[PDB]
Structure formats: structure tokens, C-alpha cells
Amino acid sequence: SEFMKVTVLSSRAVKPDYGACGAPPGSTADVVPLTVLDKANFDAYISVIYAFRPPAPPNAVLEAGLARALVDYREWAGRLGVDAASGDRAILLCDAGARFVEATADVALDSVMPMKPTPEVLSLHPSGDDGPEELMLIQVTRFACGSIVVGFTAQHLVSDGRATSNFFLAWSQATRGLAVDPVPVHDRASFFKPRDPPRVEFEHRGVEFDVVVVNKVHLSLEFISKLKSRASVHSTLRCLVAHLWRCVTKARGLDGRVSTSVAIAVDGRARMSPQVPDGYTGNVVLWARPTATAQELVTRPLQHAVELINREVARINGGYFESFIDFASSELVTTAMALSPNIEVDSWLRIPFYDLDFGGGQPFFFMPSYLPVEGLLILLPSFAGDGSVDAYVPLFSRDMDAFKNCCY
């Protein structure tokens, strides 16, 4: 709301507190080169906010806990540069530090809840658009009621959703004086090395190489069970992605002959042999791209779209990851504000919530930052614990009513 004025009071580097962990100072000359799966992502920041109720730890305890957590996550204390002996793009573990921003809002948090995705959400996390050198930027905003908002702005080249989520939990763990779990794995040069000889088994070229308003659409358990009915011979996520893909295509009013594709993130950790440990700090993500004609997607039953997604997601297996790694290492540029005729669905259904505790209990709210990018959908839990889903849909003003009608 126009009355929630955020005053940013201070900003400071937080470096790793080796002493608080009882660990040997690391060398500020340590370098971790980016893997080919890291460089499959774009040089850009992703932002999220968490809200906590008044019994909130002081800024000093949160900051000490960040310094402690950054011993096991030096990547987020580091800078992007080039390794001297390689000429390769790398994370320099120079321990320069993550940005910690302290701020106040001159309103009770309750007075602006439920918080909807507007540009005013951007005020509750550090910017990822003003060329920050820090790879992790954290803001704590204390409201007049003693509630806090914790905002994250994180560089995608460093970590995927899972790895970034691990850091969030690691910071909560360290703040309470605990060891971090999972135990992190940082030795990236050990991972995603080409095969001898190199085997490319798929086509990686063409794949990896009015105003937009964001509206929150709530999808109930009842509505989900009905969708699952119209798709019967399964997966909540696969059904919902298929529904949202149909409804965006219908809402856009595309000519039926236009080819439309949904990008779906696939975690390769459990798909590859040997498995990548859940503690791996880096990206292990490639994208399934089920494609259809707009006509084939809207006129054919929901079942057809679900099946396209199922078959394309199952194609992105250990072997696909291995094909990508060998090719990305061979002798182009990655394909990573309007996706039409395509969409992307970023699923955050595994986001830490119930267990993110800094000492004052779990959060009562979470939201993606305002991302006014047409067709970039973010799927989120509703926080009710019932399995209901919240979809944040950016569409042009003219299309949003048409999208909501189709959705319901």
C-alpha cells in the first residue's frame, strides 16, 4: 500500500565468521570455476520475501547467523570473475561478503496483508538490477508491529532453486547455533566432466544454445481434484502446468497454427548416475520443452497436454544431462520480458517454510518478488498445508480476465 514507506537505514558486507564455527580461515585466493550446468543459466538475480510474526530475533542475531552460515556457503560471500590459470568464468571465494540491508516500514505488517504482487514488493529486498557485485543480498525490514520481512536477492549462476533453498535453511540453522544440514559439497571441478570420448545423443542447438500485471490465482484441493477428473485414463503439477498452458494460450488469443511451448525445470541430481548429493551448492537444472500448436493444445482434451508434458519431462534423463555436458564442453551462447508464444512454469512447491526458524518460529507468509514478465508463471504452496497451490500469472491487462475465466 502507498502508506507502507520502507526506509533503508544501512547496508554492510557480512564475511564468513570462521571463529564462531571453530574452523580454519579459508584462503581469499580460493576459486571455484562455474560448471557447464551453471553457465546454462543467465547472469541474473532471483528475489523472494518471507514474513515472520512479532517474536522476531534482533538484526544482530540474524547477522551473526549469516556470518556463521557463510563459512559453509563462501560462494554467497564471493564475487563472479575469471580464474587466472584457465581463463574460465568462476566464483572467487575472496570472502568480500554478502550484502546485509537493515530497513524499517512505518506500518503494521497486518495493514498490507494479504500482500499482492505489485512493484511495491521490490521495496522489501535488495535490487538485482543496479549491478551489485555481491552474489547474495539480504534485507531485514522491521514493521511497527515488530513483524519482520526477510528478502533474498540471489545470483542464479551460483545456485539453482534447491541449492538456494539449502542456504536459506542453513542461515536459519546457523542463527540457532546448529551445524548446517545438508552438509554442503563445493568441489564443482569434480562434477559434470565430459565423457571420453564425447557423446552428443540429442539436439542442444535451438534448445539450450498495454502493460503486464501479476495476479495471484488460488487453486483449491477441490478444483485440483476436478482437473484430475478431466485428465483420467498422474501428477497435480503436470495437470496444473497443462491447464495453465492451455488457459494462457486461450487468453492470448493466438492463431491456432502457432507452435507453443512450456519450459519445465528438471532437477538432474537423482536422474544422473553417480547421483549428485543434495548438498551440492551449484545448478543441476535443464528444461523439458513440451511443444504443441495452440489449436492442438486448446481444442484437444487436458489429457493430451498432460501426456505431452509426461513424455518430454521423462526424455530429460541422466542420458540427456550427459549429452548436454559433452556438447556444452565442445567447440554458441545460452538461450536463458514477454515469452509469447511460449510460457515458463517455475515450481517452488519445495520452498522451505515450515522448518525455516531463526529462533522465533516459522514464517506465516512467503511470496515471489514482482516479476512482470508475460508468461513467466510461478507455482507456490498456499501455506494452508492442505496441498492447495497459488499461481502468480503475469499477463497483459487485456488478457487477464480471459485467463481467470478459463482457469475456473
Q: What structural domains and CATH numbers belong to the chain?
A: 6-190 (3.30.559.10), 212-331+337-407 (3.30.559.10)
Centre a 10 Å sphere on the Cβ of residue 22 and count the other Cβ atoms it contains.
Answer: 7
- Asked if 175 contacts 361 with a C-beta cutoff of 8 angstroms, the reply is no
Counting every residue written for the chain, the total comes to: 408
- Asked if 319 contacts 201 with a C-beta cutoff of 8 angstroms, the reply is yes
| Strand 6-14, strand 98-105: pairing | antiparallel
**Could you tell me the strand order of the sheet in which 6-14 lies?**
6-14, 98-105, 136-142, 148-155, 45-52, 365-368
Short-list 64, 53, 133, CA closest to 94: 133
The active-site residue, picked from 30, 267, 346, 357, is 357
Listing DSSP states for 288-314 in one string gives E--EEEHHHHHHS-HHHHHHHHHHHHH
**How far apart (Å, rounded) are the C-alpha atoms in residues 60 and 175?**
10
Show Cβ contacts of residue 81 under 8 Å, excluding neighbours closer than 6 positions: 89, 90, 92
Short-list 158, 371, 269, 311, CA closest to 167: 158
The active-site residue, picked from 125, 156, 186, 204, is 156
Type of residue numbered 9: L
- Asked if 400 contacts 215 with a C-beta cutoff of 8 angstroms, the reply is yes
SS3 254: coil
SS3 224: helix
Q: Is 210 one of the annotated active-site residues of the chain?
A: no
**How far apart (Å, rounded) are the C-alpha atoms in residues 261 and 245?**
8
Counting Cβ atoms within 10 Å, is residue 223 exposed (0-12), middle (13-18) or buried (19+)?
A: middle
**Could you tell me the strand order of the sheet in which 79-82 lies?**
31-33, 89-92, 79-82
Per DSSP, 106 falls in state: S
SS3 letters across 2-26: CCCCEEEEEEEEECCCHHHHCCCCC
- Asked if 37 contacts 285 with a C-beta cutoff of 8 angstroms, the reply is yes
Q: Considering Cα of 301, then 303, then 304, then 306, what sign does the dihedral take? A: positive
Listing DSSP states for 345-382 in one string gives EEE-TT---TT--SSS---SEEEE-----BTEEEEEE-
**How far apart (Å, rounded) are the C-alpha atoms in residues 260 and 283?**
26
Vertex 164 angle, CA 283 and 67, to 5°: 125
Per DSSP, 40 falls in state: T
Q: How far is CA 56 from CA 11, 141, 177, 347, 360, in A?
A: 20, 11, 16, 29, 5
**Residue 152 backbone phi and psi in degrees, to 5:** -115, 140
Residue 108 is placed in which grid cell? 503494521
- Asked if 28 contacts 93 with a C-beta cutoff of 8 angstroms, the reply is yes
Q: Is 156 one of the annotated active-site residues of the chain?
A: yes
**How far apart (Å, rounded) are the C-alpha atoms in residues 195 and 203?**
17
Distance of CA 398 to the CA centre of its chain: 28
Place of cell 488457459: 247
